[PDB]
Amino acid sequence: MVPISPIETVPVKLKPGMDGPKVKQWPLTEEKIKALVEICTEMEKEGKISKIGPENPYNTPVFAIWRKLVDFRELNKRTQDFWEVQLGIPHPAGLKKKKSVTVLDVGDAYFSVPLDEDFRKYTAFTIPSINNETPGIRYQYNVLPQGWKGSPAIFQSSMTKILEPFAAQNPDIVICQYMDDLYVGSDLEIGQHRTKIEELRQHLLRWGLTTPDKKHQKEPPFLWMGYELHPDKWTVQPIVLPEKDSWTVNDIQKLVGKLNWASQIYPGIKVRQLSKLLRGTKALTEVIPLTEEAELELAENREILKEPVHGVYYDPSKDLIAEIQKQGQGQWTYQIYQEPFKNLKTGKYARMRGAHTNDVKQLTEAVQKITTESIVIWGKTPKFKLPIQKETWETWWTEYWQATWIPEWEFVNTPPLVKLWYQLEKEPIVGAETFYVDGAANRETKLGKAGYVTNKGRQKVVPLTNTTNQKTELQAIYLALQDSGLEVNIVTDSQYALGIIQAQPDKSESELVNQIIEQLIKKEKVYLAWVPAHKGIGGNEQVDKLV
Amino acid sequence: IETVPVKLKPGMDGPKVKQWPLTEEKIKALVEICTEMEKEGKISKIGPENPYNTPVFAIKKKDSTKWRKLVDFRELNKRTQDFWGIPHPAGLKKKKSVTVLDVGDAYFSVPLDEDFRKYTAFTIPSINNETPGIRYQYNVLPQGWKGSPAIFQSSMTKILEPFKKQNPDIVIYQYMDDLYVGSDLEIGQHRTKIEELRQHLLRWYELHPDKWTVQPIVLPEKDSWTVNDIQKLVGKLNWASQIYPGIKVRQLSKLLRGTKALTEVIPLTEEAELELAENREILKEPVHGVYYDPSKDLIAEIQKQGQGQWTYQIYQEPFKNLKTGKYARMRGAHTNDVKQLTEAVQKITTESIVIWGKTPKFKLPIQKETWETWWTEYWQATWIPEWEFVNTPPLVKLWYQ
Numbered sequence: 001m002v003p004i005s006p007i008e009t010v011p012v013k014l015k016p017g018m019d020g021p022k023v024k025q026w027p028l029t030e031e032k033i034k035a036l037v038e039i040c041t042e043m044e045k046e047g048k049i050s051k052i053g054p055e056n057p058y059n060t061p062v063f064a065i066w067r068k069l070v071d072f073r074e075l076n077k078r079t080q081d082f083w084e085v086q087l088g089i090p091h092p093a094g095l096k097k098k099k100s101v102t103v104l105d106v107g108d109a110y111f112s113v114p115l116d117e118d119f120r121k122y123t124a125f126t127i128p129s130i131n132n133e134t135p136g137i138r139y140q141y142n143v144l145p146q147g148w149k150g151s152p153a154i155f156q157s158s159m160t161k162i163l164e165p166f167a168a169q170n171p172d173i174v175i176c177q178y179m180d181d182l183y184v185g186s187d188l189e190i191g192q193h194r195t196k197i198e199e200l201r202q203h204l205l206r207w208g209l210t211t212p213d214k215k216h217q218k219e220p221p222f223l224w225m226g227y228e229l230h231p232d233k234w235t236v237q238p239i240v241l242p243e244k245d246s247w248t249v250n251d252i253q254k255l256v257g258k259l260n261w262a263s264q265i266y267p268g269i270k271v272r273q274l275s276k277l278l279r280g281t282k283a284l285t286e287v288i289p290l291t292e293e294a295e296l297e298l299a300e301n302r303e304i305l306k307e308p309v310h311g312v313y314y315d316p317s318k319d320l321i322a323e324i325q326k327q328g329q330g331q332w333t334y335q336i337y338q339e340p341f342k343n344l345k346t347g348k349y350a351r352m353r354g355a356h357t358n359d360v361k362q363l364t365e366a367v368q369k370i371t372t373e374s375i376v377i378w379g380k381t382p383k384f385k386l387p388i389q390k391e392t393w394e395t396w397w398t399e400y401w402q403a404t405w406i407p408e409w410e411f412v413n414t415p416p417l418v419k420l421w422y423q424l425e426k427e428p429i430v431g432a433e434t435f436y437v438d439g440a441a442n443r444e445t446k447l448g449k450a451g452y453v454t455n456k457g458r459q460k461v462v463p464l465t466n467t468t469n470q471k472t473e474l475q476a477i478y479l480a481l482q483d484s485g486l487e488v489n490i491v492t493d494s495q496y497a498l499g500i501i502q503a504q505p506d507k508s509e510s511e512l513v514n515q516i517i518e519q520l521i522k523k524e525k526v527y528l529a530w531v532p533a534h535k536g537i538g539g540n541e542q543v544d545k546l547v
Numbered sequence: 548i549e550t551v552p553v554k555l556k557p558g559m560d561g562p563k564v565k566q567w568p569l570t571e572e573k574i575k576a577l578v579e580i581c582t583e584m585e586k587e588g589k590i591s592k593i594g595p596e597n598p599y600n601t602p603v604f605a606i607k608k609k610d611s612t613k614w615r616k617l618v619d620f621r622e623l624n625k626r627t628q629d630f631w632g633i634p635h636p637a638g639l640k641k642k643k644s645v646t647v648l649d650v651g652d653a654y655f656s657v658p659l660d661e662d663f664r665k666y667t668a669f670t671i672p673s674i675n676n677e678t679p680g681i682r683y684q685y686n687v688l689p690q691g692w693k694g695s696p697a698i699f700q701s702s703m704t705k706i707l708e709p710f711k712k713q714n715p716d717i718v719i720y721q722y723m724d725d726l727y728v729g730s731d732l733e734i735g736q737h738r739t740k741i742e743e744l745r746q747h748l749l750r751w752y753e754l755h756p757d758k759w760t761v762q763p764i765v766l767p768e769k770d771s772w773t774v775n776d777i778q779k780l781v782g783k784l785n786w787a788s789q790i791y792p793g794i795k796v797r798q799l800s801k802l803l804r805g806t807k808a809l810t811e812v813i814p815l816t817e818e819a820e821l822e823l824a825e826n827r828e829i830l831k832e833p834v835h836g837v838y839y840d841p842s843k844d845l846i847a848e849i850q851k852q853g854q855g856q857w858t859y860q861i862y863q864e865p866f867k868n869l870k871t872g873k874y875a876r877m878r879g880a881h882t883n884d885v886k887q888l889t890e891a892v893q894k895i896t897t898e899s900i901v902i903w904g905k906t907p908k909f910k911l912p913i914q915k916e917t918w919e920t921w922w923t924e925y926w927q928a929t930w931i932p933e934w935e936f937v938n939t940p941p942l943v944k945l946w947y948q
C-alpha cells in the first residue's frame with residue numbers, strides 16, 4: 001500500500017459555557033431500523049463512524065428518508081462560530097475567459113477529512129433497537145458529518161491547503177473550489193490541459209482523495225445560481241414575465257425579483273411602479289390593482305426582455321468603462337463594458353428615501369455604487385461616461401457646501417442631461433426690489449398668514465387655514481417669488497427655509513417647495529439673505545403676519 | 548522576550564468586522580507585505596476556527612513609493628481592556644517645534660500573548676469573492692493596536708533613558724506608533740537632533756505648535772455700511788451672543804428699521820458705533836468657563852469654505868470651543884474635495900493628539916457613501932479616528948469665515 005498523507009485536523013470547540021447536545025432519539029419503525037443498521041455497518045466498515053460505549057452522555061437524533069439523515073440542529077446551535085466559507089457570490093462578469101474549463105468531482109473527499117478527536121464525542125447518535133429490547137447501537141463520527149455547522153468551512157480550508165502547492169507550481173492554470181467540485185481552467189492546448197488535469201488527479205490521490213474517471217455530469221452551458229455560463233459569454237437563466245389577468249402580492253414580488261435579477265444584463269429595466277405597489281402592504285395574499293404607470297413600465301420591460309441578451313467575460317488588458325443614463329423619477333441605469341456594444345454587465349440605481357433631492361446628488365450616489373461594485377467584481381474603478389457637462393459639475397462641486405468627488409469621467413451627450421436648474425447670488429443685487437418676507441401660524445387653530453413688504457412699498461398678506469410655521473415661511477418666500485421681477489432680493493428669518501434652499505433641491509415631496517423651485521427656475525437673479533427674528537430688524541415684520 | 552497576559556473587557560467577544568473591497572494593486576501589495584511578514588514570523592496563517600476579523604488596507608506614506616499595510620483596529624481597540632496611566636505632557640503643545648517619528652517597527656520585536664493572538668485576525672480579500680480570503684493573525688505586537696504602546700512602554704523608557712537624561716529640555720510623548728519630540732532649537736539643530744535620536748533608536752514631519760493660536764471672532768471695519776452689511780453683522784453678533792454674554796444688538800438693529808433696499812448705504816448713529824465698539828471689546832476677551840474634561844469625548848466640526856479653505860472647531864460642550872483653526876494648505880488636492888477633507892481630518896487629529904493625547908470625534912460635511920468610498924485612498928496616518936456625517940447645511944459656516 002502506498003502511504004496516504006494525513007490531513008491536518010482543525011481544532012473545534014463549543015460555544016463558551018455551553019455543553020454538548022443531549023436530544024432524545026425518536027422511535028423508528030423496524031424497517032427503518034434495519035436500513036440504518038445496514039447503512040451504519042457499511043459506514044463503520046469504511047471508517048466514517050465508530051462504535052462507542054455507554055460513557056458518552058451525548059446524543060443526536062437520526063432519521064431515514066434508505067438514506068441516513070442526522071439532525072445536527074442542536075449541536076449546530078452549540079458549536080462555535082467559524083470563518084465564512086464565502087464573503088459573497090462571484091459574479092460571472094468577473095470571470096476571465098479560458099480555452100478549457102474542466103470539472104472534477106471531489107465529493108468523495110468530504111468523508112475523507114478527519115474530525116477533531118476531542119470533538120467527535122459530541123457527534124454521538126443512537127440507532128434504536130428492534131422492539132427496544134436491547135440497547136441501541138451507539139456511534140460517533142470520525143469525519144466531517146453532512147449537516148454539521150463546521151463541515152463546509154473545514155472542508156474548504158483543508159482542500160485549499162492541499163491544492164496550494166499544486167496551484168503555486170502551476171501558475172499557467174486556474175483552480176477554483178466550489179462546494180464539492182473543482183474547476184480547472186487554462187488557455188493551454190487541450191492535450192496539455194488534460195495532462196495537467198491528470199497531474200491534479202494524482203496530486204489529490206496522494207492524500208487518498210479520489211476523482212471519478214467517469215465522464216462528468218456538468219458540461220456547457222453551466223447552469224449556476226440563476227446564471228448560464230458559456231465558453232465565450234454569460235447571461236441570466238431565461239426570464240419569462242407571466243401573463244396575468246390580475247396580480248397578487250406574491251406575483252408582484254416574483255415579478256420585481258425577475259426584473260431586478262434580469263437588470264444585471266438587460267439594460268433599461270425599471271422597477272419603480274411595480275415595487276411602489278408593494279408599499280406598506282405586509283400581506284402576501286392581498287390583490288392590488290395595477291396603475292397605468294405600472295402597465296407602461298411592464299410593457300417596456302416585456303419589450304426589453306423579448307429576445308436574449310448576453311454579457312462578455314472580463315479581459316484585464318482592456319480598459320473598464322461605465323456609462324450612466326437618467327430614466328426619471330429617481331431611476332438611473334448603467335452599462336459596464338470594455339468594447340462598445342459588448343457589455344460586461346448592466347444595472348440600475350434608485351434614489352434613496354428623502355424629502356428633497358436633485359439630479360447631481362443622485363448621479364453622484366450612482367457613481368459611488370458603480371465604483372464599489374466594480375472594485376468588488378474586477379478590482380478597479382472604471383472610467384465613467386456621464387450625461388453632465390464638465391462646467392456643470394465644476395460649478396456644482398465648487399459651490400456646494402459639502403465635499404464631493406467623482407472619479408475620472410468624461411461627458412457623453414445623451415439626453416436627458418443633468419443640469420443645474422438655479423443658482424443663488426453671492427451678493428445682494430443692485431437695482432432689484434427687496435422683499436422682506438414672513439409667515440406665522442397658530443399652533444391650536446392652525447390658522448396662519450404669509451406675506452412680504454418691499455422697499456418700493458409693495459405689500460401682501462395672505463391668510464391660510466390648516467398650516468404651520470414652516471409652511472407659512474415657505475409660502476412667504478413663494479409669494480415673494482411670484483410677485484417680483486426677474487431679479488429680486490429676498491430677506492427671511494426662517495432657518496428652516498434657508499436649510500432647505502441651501503441644499504439646492506430640484507424636486508421635493510412638498511408641493512410648496514416644488515412651486516418655489518419652479519419659481520426659482522424662471523428668475524434671472526435671486527439673492528436670499530437671512531436675518532434673526534424678533535430682533536427689531538425693521539422690514540422683517542413679525543407683527544404683520546401674527547394678526 | 549516574555550509575553551504579558553492580555554484579555555478583553557468582561558462580556559465582550561472579539562471583533563468581527565467586515566473587510567471592505569480593495570483594488571487589485573492594494574491586494575497584491577498586501578500579499579507581498581504579508582508574505583514577507585510571514586517569513587519573519589510576525590504573522591501566521593490561521594484556519595477556519597478563527598471567526599474574528601479586523602479590516603486591512605494599504606497606503607503610501609509621505610515621500611515614499613513603498614506600500615504600507617494599515618490595519619483598522621478601532622473595534623479591537625475599544626474592545627480591548629483598559630491599560631494603565633501617564634499624565635499627558637501639557638508642555639508639548641507649548642514647545643516651539645515638534646517632530647513625529649514612526650516607531651512602529653520596534654513593536655514587532657516583542658511577542659504577543661498566546662491566547663490573545665486570535666483576536667488580531669485579518670483577511671486579505673479576493674477579487675470577485677472567489678475565495679474566502681487569505682487569513683492571518685499576529686504573533687507580535689501589531690501596529691495600530693492600543694495595547695502595543697502600553698506593553699512596550701517599559702522598553703521604550705529603557706531605550707529613551709540616556710537621551711532623556713542627556714537633554715532635559717526636550718519633551719517626548721508617545722501615541723500609538725508615533726513619537727512626538729518637542730524642543731525650542733533651530734530647524735537645522737532640530738533636524739540634526741532628530742537624526743541623533745533616530746540613530747540612537749536604530750542601534751537598539753516639521754510641526755510648529757508655537758505658530759498656532761486660537762482664533763477670535765472678528766467684526767468688519769467699514770466706513771460705509773449697506774443694509775445687507777448691517778444685517779449680516781447683526782446675525783453674526785446674535786450668533787456670538789450664545790458664546791459671549793454681554794453682546795448687544797438693539798442699537799444696530801435700530802438702523803434696520805424700515806423696508807430699505809439691501810444695497811442702500813446706512814450711516815451709523817453714535818449709539819450704534821458705541822454698541823459695536825463694546826461688542827469688539829467683549830469679543831477680545833476669552834470665553835468664560837472653558838475647561839477640558841478628560842472623561843468626555845472631543846468633538847471636531849469642519850466647514851468647507853471654498854477655494855481650498857477649511858475651518859474647524861474642537862469643543863466638548865456647545866459654544867465652549869477648546870480649539871479653533873483654519874486649514875487652507877494646498878498640497879496636490881486642488882481638484883479633489885475629499886482628499887482635502889481627509890488631509891484636514893489627519894491634521895486636526897494630529898493637533899488633538901498633541902494637545903490632549905487622544906483623538907476627537909469628527910462631524911464631516913460629506914455624504915456617508917462618498918467618504919466611505921474614498922477616504923482610504925488619501926489616508927496616510929497610523930491611527931484612525933471616529934466620524935459621523937452632517938447632511939443639513941449649518942448656517943454658522945460664514946460666521947467662521
Ligand SMILES: *CC(=O)N(C)c1cc(Oc2ccccc2OCCn2ccc(=O)[nH]c2=O)c(C)c2cc(C#N)ccc12
Nearest residue numbers: 090095096097098101176178183185222223224229230231
Ligand atoms: C469556481 C467559482 O467560484 N465559480 C463561481 C465558478 C466559475 C466557473 O468558471 C470558471 C472556473 C474556472 C476557471 C475559469 C472559469 O470561468 C472563466 C469563464 N468561463 C466560464 C465558463 C466556460 O465554459 N468558459 C469560460 O472561459 C464555472 C464554470 C462555475 C460553474 C458552476 C456550476 N455548475 C459553479 C461555479 C462556477
